[PDB]
Amino acid sequence: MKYMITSKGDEKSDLLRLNMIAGFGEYDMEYDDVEPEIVISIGGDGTFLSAFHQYEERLDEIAFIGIHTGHLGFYADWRPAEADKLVKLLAKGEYQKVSYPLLKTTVKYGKEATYLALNESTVKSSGGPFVVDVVINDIHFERFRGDGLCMSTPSGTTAYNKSLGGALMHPSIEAMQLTEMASINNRVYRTIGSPLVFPKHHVVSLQPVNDKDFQISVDHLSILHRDVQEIRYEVSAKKIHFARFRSFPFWRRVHDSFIED
Amino acid sequence: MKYMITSKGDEKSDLLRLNMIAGFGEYDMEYDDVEPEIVISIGGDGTFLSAFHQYEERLDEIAFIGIHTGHLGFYADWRPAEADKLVKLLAKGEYQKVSYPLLKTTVKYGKEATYLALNESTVKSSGGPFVVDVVINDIHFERFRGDGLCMSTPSGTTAYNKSLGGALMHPSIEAMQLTEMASINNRVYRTIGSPLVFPKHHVVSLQPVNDKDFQISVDHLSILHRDVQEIRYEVSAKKIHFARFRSFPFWRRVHDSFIED
Amino acid sequence: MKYMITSKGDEKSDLLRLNMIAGFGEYDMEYDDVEPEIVISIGGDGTFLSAFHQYEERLDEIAFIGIHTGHLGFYADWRPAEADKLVKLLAKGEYQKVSYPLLKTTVKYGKEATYLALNESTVKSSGGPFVVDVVINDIHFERFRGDGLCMSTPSGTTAYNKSLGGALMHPSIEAMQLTEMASINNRVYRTIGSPLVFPKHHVVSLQPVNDKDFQISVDHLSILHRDVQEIRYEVSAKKIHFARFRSFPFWRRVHDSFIED
Amino acid sequence: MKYMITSKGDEKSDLLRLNMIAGFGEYDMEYDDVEPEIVISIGGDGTFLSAFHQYEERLDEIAFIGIHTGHLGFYADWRPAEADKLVKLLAKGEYQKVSYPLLKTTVKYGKEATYLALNESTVKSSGGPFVVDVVINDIHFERFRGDGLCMSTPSGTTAYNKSLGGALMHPSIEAMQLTEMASINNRVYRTIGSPLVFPKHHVVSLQPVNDKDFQISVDHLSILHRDVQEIRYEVSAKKIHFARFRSFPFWRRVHDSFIED
Ligand SMILES: N=C(N)NCCCC(=O)NC[C@H]1O[C@@H](n2c(C#CCOC[C@H]3O[C@@H](n4cnc5c(N)ncnc54)[C@H](O)[C@@H]3O)nc3c(N)ncnc32)[C@H](O)[C@@H]1O
Ligand SMILES: N=C(N)NCCCC(=O)NC[C@H]1O[C@@H](n2c(C#CCOC[C@H]3O[C@@H](n4cnc5c(N)ncnc54)[C@H](O)[C@@H]3O)nc3c(N)ncnc32)[C@H](O)[C@@H]1O
Numbered sequence A, B, C, D: 001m002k003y004m005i006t007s008k009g010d011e012k013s014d015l016l017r018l019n020m021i022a023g024f025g026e027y028d029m030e031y032d033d034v035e036p037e038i039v040i041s042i043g044g045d046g047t048f049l050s051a052f053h054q055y056e057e058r059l060d061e062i063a064f065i066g067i068h069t070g071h072l073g074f075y076a077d078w079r080p081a082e083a084d085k086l087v088k089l090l091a092k093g094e095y096q097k098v099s100y101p102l103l104k105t106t107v108k109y110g111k112e113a114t115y116l117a118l119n120e121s122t123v124k125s126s127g128g129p130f131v132v133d134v135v136i137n138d139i140h141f142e143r144f145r146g147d148g149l150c151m152s153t154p155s156g157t158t159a160y161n162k163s164l165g166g167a168l169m170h171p172s173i174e175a176m177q178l179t180e181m182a183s184i185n186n187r188v189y190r191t192i193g194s195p196l197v198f199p200k201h202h203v204v205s206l207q208p209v210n211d212k213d214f215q216i217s218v219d220h221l222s223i224l225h226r227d228v229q230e231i232r233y234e235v236s237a238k239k240i241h242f243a244r245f246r247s248f249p250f251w252r253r254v255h256d257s258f259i260e261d
């Protein structure tokens, strides 16, 4: 069907893309980057994340594939030398689809803006100290003082979440995980410290205490938000779909990326 | 219906139990510790854990309640001065039931023994170094060298799991979480370090490397197991049921126990 | 002798300062904020840190004292109600002096700028990723990829260093401690993770890999440094001196601030 | 002068030892394992630790050397193929000596026993819960509830201390570092969590709360101590001396063992 291919833009990826386009020319495949049904990403995880956000308005109509021209990536988990066998099976179709949960972030002002995350959404201060009240399903849980907070998808747990001490969870779990960045804990200031894993339909709301300017990042994209009244986190109703052509279990991908490959 | 009450055995709990039995005498309540339908625990979380294991053969036929005569416990989350209003509503019935996932541990020899955990199951060595191969759904993930491992239920994440850096997850998530104890990591020895959260139907299997003697604990109960061939972890098909009479949200219980009450 | 007093600038501290000045008027004490020999700070640890940097050019000629009008601070460890007994003993003199090690940071360009730290010096990126080579006594130790790094004095170990997992060390140890902020560790990227404690006369040098812009902070003061060629850390030859009038042991101060007071 | 050589006892180490003895036969070297002046250890760090404890009664009269027949060890940091050049220079003498601080542990009963540690001394309970009061220079600092505690030498910081989150410190620092094992922290139970680094002449004393039986380990050696009244930790007046024949800086050894070699 309709398909498009993004490239990291180096010599290796551009050339692989042109060779795959030539392979797709031999089948009933039409190149369309407006309404594709298959999005292939050649590069790294950033390149894949860029591709997801390019088509986040059509997630239910697209199956993603990532090719890693550098090291093994978590989302780009197929090798460049296997690009031909990829072109073949993708042209025949009859593949299976694999869905991962996504994360919704809502920012209210004094207006509303929402964002979809594949890895995580983080919050930091514009420059001053970062103080925010953390409210869970309208229950005030803590007042966080520190550098910032990170709300991660399941597949994102191996990313920024991992460096902050968070747990790695399997993407079949529809959940989201909040981790701390350098919280200050003493006699007066008290946070939980432990990461928190929230189920679907739970709402985690951050509410300012003094300064209302916050550096909010969604994957690679970071934006300064002024006069913030509330940041809301919840597991999205939408999901990203992966075209799978063979078994590459999550824990196997985790073993190869962190233990030994 | 039929009910029984366990006591920590101090003066405070024994007396509260006798006073509740007297209150139940005023209703159509029969004391039966053989086949109760309501199990009340007066004491601490250990007292509650002891009560769960006393009736783990009838979990589907029992709703548990815990009264804390000392500090607030996670499972014993109702106060002694509220014991009368508890007796009333329990006698009328028409309460709601709240299920938490449990953890199944299977130990094979060279025979098989299984155990149900409400908090966690841990593994340590008999005395020598602790080396074990960690296999996830028949995929070899790592070779753990360290002090031991902890596999925790959701409700157990606030217990031993919390002191080992694990995440706290909400008990509506049917999952289990593995955390490390003092793993040795260098150029030759490599573990993941991060906690791992596993969904239902996933099997985590520990397999010995040299010594086959292991100190295996299930909640408060610890047993030396000799000639161990395999320890298997998976989320149980069985669940513990709590009789709830009002909203005491998990994150509220977490706030009170760790932040401030 | 000559003395001055800084104030946090709220009603409480300003009034305490005016009352202490009146008490000093009754003795052979001359107020001089140009060349004082005693610097008193009324407020918090920030107020004390501001006072240290106001006179970092005369550290060998000044003994510091801090009064905490809010909670107990580590540097401001004397209470407002004890201000009179402080005025008395300070006027008589014959006190003991207590020295804490300081931290020297040197920034080279393509020129040189140096800074003295009482708590810590940190490095972060201007906006892009933070990659820096860490060289210890001209030996290349690692290539750090992460959010940033923190080099802490002994007395600073209870401050930012504490929130980053660093050890708390006693200020009689002439040393400095480096801790990580959210390092990325995988098959390709490898840092030590553990905090590092360096003795006197050791030089730790950070060297850029790509981007040469870095947000460098020294205590409360943060400055964007462009075209950075090198950041050098070493234990200063200079020391801050505290006027002590009674035993307030470091570990006692640590107990009161973090365990219970 | 007088010398002896210990062996791990495998084929590789035994044969290297016999070949070095033959090399020493060609010089004015007499084999004496009663009063040696040079102790060579062929094997791993355990083999080296065993050798240190074999002659802990003559530390001031002995310079140690370790050869690693397996992977690089921290104490055994010279390779088997370099054994000949080692024999030569050792026979000529005129080497430099390098001292590392040691750790003294004193156990009182209701009698006294002391031990010297090269890596660390740890405390765990005999079987029940581990509760101990931690007193620093006669000041009560905390009541530790958890799995156990670890008091480490500087050179030991890369060993068990490293797996418990402790900092790695350079052995020219005469100090000792205490780290926690799975402390329980909640509203009622409070420990510092952070590692603590203590200078020379500081005394850290552990004092029982209920059960007085403790599993105390000093390096590889673990002993059950009954009716314990006090465990005291302080930096030893004694030091281990290493015969050095070239520069192998501590941080270089750390880089090779943990980053890449
Ligand atoms: N956030 C910005 N713009 N700057 C920080 C750049 C840090 C960096 O070197 N990230 C790339 C690496 O992460 C891997 N990766 C990715 C990716 C990617 C592209 O980056 C953006 C992402 O980064 C993460 N990041 C940000 N800051 C840190 C930090 N301090 N430490 C660790 N990660 C960090 C964050 O997640 C963000 O989205 N996706 C993964 C996943 N799902 N699983 C496992 N590896 C995964 C990928 O292969 C590669 O090895
Ligand atoms: N494992 C044995 N026999 N000895 C260790 C005793 C350590 C201890 O003081 N535990 C009781 C405390 O935990 C709380 N608790 C409980 C409980 C209980 C009864 O204990 C047995 C349990 O302990 C846990 N434990 C064992 N070792 C450690 C350790 N080193 N650090 C922290 N906990 C530990 C482990 O989980 C075990 O099952 N259940 C909780 C939950 N679900 N959520 C949050 N608090 C919870 C409870 O109120 C009380 O404050």
Ligand SMILES: N=C(N)NCCCC(=O)NC[C@H]1O[C@@H](n2c(C#CCOC[C@H]3O[C@@H](n4cnc5c(N)ncnc54)[C@H](O)[C@@H]3O)nc3c(N)ncnc32)[C@H](O)[C@@H]1O
Residues within 6 Å of the ligand: A128, A129, A145, A146, A147, A181, A182, A183, A184, C044, C045, C046, C049, C072, C073, C074, C075, C119, C120, C155, C156, C157, C158, C159, C160, C161, C163, C218, C219, C220, C221
């Ligand atoms: N860095 C800026 N401008 N913004 C961050 C502000 C974070 C904050 O609430 N710090 C004040 C608290 O630290 C205590 N403190 C101080 C102090 C102070 C004044 O602040 C500046 C200092 O902060 C530290 N800081 C920065 N970021 C973090 C973070 N994420 N987490 C924890 N601390 C942080 C850093 O050290 C800096 O110098 N000095 C201490 C010491 N020597 N010992 C133990 N407490 C100490 C003091 O009582 C008070 O309870």
Ligand SMILES: N=C(N)NCCCC(=O)NC[C@H]1O[C@@H](n2c(C#CCOC[C@H]3O[C@@H](n4cnc5c(N)ncnc54)[C@H](O)[C@@H]3O)nc3c(N)ncnc32)[C@H](O)[C@@H]1O
Residues within 6 Å of the ligand: B128, B129, B145, B146, B147, B181, B182, B183, B184, D044, D045, D046, D049, D072, D073, D074, D075, D119, D120, D155, D156, D157, D158, D159, D160, D161, D163, D218, D219, D220, D221
């Ligand atoms: N404690 C007993 N009997 N059983 C635990 C055995 C754990 C183990 O595999 N240790 C050997 C490794 O440590 C390295 N090592 C040594 C050594 C050695 C001989 O062991 C005894 C030592 O172990 C340490 N140990 C005990 N338990 C743990 C644990 N859970 N995690 C990590 N280490 C542990 C402890 O320190 C003890 O003394 N000395 C080092 C140093 N100075 N620097 C850096 N590496 C060093 C050595 O090369 C080798 O790679």
